[PDB]
Amino acid sequence: HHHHHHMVHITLDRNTANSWLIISKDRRQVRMGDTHQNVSDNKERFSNYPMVLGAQRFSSGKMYWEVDVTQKEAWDLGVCRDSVQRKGQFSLSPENGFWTIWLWQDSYEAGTSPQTTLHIQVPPCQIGIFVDYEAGVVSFYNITDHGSLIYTFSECVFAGPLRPFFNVGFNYSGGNAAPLKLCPL
Numbered sequence: 223h224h225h226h227h228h229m230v231h232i233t234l235d236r237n238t239a240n241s242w243l244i245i246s247k248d249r250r251q252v253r254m255g256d257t258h259q260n261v262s263d264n265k266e267r268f269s270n271y272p273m274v275l276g277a278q279r280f281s282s283g284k285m286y287w288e289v290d291v292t293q294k295e296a297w298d299l300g301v302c303r304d305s306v307q308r309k310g311q312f313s314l315s316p317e318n319g320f321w322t323i324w325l326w327q328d329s330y331e332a333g334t335s336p337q338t339t340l341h342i343q344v345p346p347c348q349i350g351i352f353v354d355y356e357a358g359v360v361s362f363y364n365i366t367d368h369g370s371l372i373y374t375f376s377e378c379v380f381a382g383p384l385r386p387f388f389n390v391g392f393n394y395s396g397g398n399a400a401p402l403k404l405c406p407l
């Protein structure tokens with residue numbers, strides 16, 4: 223792809239994080255802690271899943287960033303509306319304000335409703351995410367496989383400002399402790 227020149231510097235918003243997440247000093251990495259991280263509750267925190275938002279809000283333009291997923295077994299990545307539900311159970315779908323892909327149980331899927339099987343021959347260690355606000359597009363790229371296309375959501379109805387979206391996944395297996403990392407420009 224040729225989207226690299228739209229690179230934006232994303233940082234994580236601590237205030238939105240589930241209370242078990244540990245975000246690095248530079249706000250560029252996040253991992254699952256083994257316990258509650260001793261923060262106060264607030265209405266912004268995702269309560270039921272290991273989720274966090276980027277601090278940046280987008281309402282126009284073209285934006286690109288990259289995320290390192292090395293050695294993870296499960297995660298979700300993409301964008302979401304600023305006003306998505308934070309508390310309780312919900313599915314990741316465009317109807318609920320999410321444009322995402324995930325890894326789960328050795329396969330990759332797009333967060334449509336119902337979900338869509340992805341076709342990935344080279345498991346990615348880094349993911350590229352491209353948003354074209356005006357066009358209504360969210361696309362995902364396999365950086366490990368020379369930038370090959372993973373998935374495009376088109377005809378998106380964002381209906382609000384967008385924020386970068388992350389889920390580090392649970393670590394029931396003991397094999398999913400590795401962080402998500404925002405990769406340098």
Ligand SMILES: CS(=O)(=O)c1nccn1Cc1cscn1
Nearest residue numbers: 268269270271308309310311312
């Ligand atoms: C916030 S929540 O959705 O976890 C919830 N709070 C009360 C009941 N449930 C449902 C539940 C518990 S185990 C799986 N689903």
